[PDB]
Design a protein around this ligand. Structure first.
Ligand SMILES: O=C(O)C(F)(F)C(F)(F)C(F)(F)C(F)(F)C(F)(F)C(F)(F)C(F)(F)C(F)(F)C(F)(F)C(F)(F)C(F)(F)C(F)(F)C(F)(F)C(F)(F)C(F)(F)F
Length: 131
């Protein structure tokens, strides 16, 4: 995951409110979470990948090995079972909870890290640049 490692800052977000609605996030959390401009810090140590998100809304940190399911409490307080894999150089992060599923894809495009969050037919695209 060499191309992903570093410190990234959110610079643009499209359709994130609609994505959060589809996920089931409530009004007040959607409003405050949508304002946030997080710094995402990605690091690798051996087989272990760590993704931290620091923001004024809620700090999160996940560590994982590709292909190996883990427990995650999301920033909006869902308790989900997550599996992250690499698919053709794209990090694919599937979250399962309450019979529902959402997929977050992270990919390098030019000097940006593009995050696509998909819930059924609703996609949000969030673009990060190096800090
Ligand atoms: O990283 C991105 O830009 C991304 F946004 F694509 C993403 F994070 F991958 C994500 F939206 F998919 C996700 F993980 F937050 C999530 F899985 F959707 C989620 F579970 F966090 C969520 F989006 F569903 C949420 F929890 F509902 C949320 F609303 F809280 C939030 F907005 F995403 C948020 F809280 F995480 C935040 F506001 F975005 C934040 F700024 F607080 C931050 F946690 F720092 C973060 F943005 F880094 F997430």
């Amino acid at each position: 995951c060499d191309a992903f490692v570093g410190t990234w800052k959110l610079v643009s977000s499209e359709n994130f409110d609609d994505y959060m609605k589809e996920v089931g996030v409530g009004f007040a959390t959607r409003k405050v979470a949508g304002m946030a401009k997080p710094n995402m810090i990605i690091s690798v140590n051996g087989d272990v990948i760590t993704i931290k998100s620091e923001s004024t809304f809620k700090n999160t940190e996940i560590s994982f090995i590709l292909g190996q399911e883990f427990d995650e409490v999301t920033a909006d307080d869902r308790k989900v079972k997550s599996t992250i894999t690499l698919d053709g150089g794209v990090l694919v992060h599937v979250q399962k909870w309450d019979g529902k599923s959402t997929t977050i894809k992270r990919k390098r495009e030019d000097d940006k890290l593009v995050v696509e969050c998909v819930m059924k037919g609703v996609t949000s695209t969030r673009v990060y640049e190096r800090a």
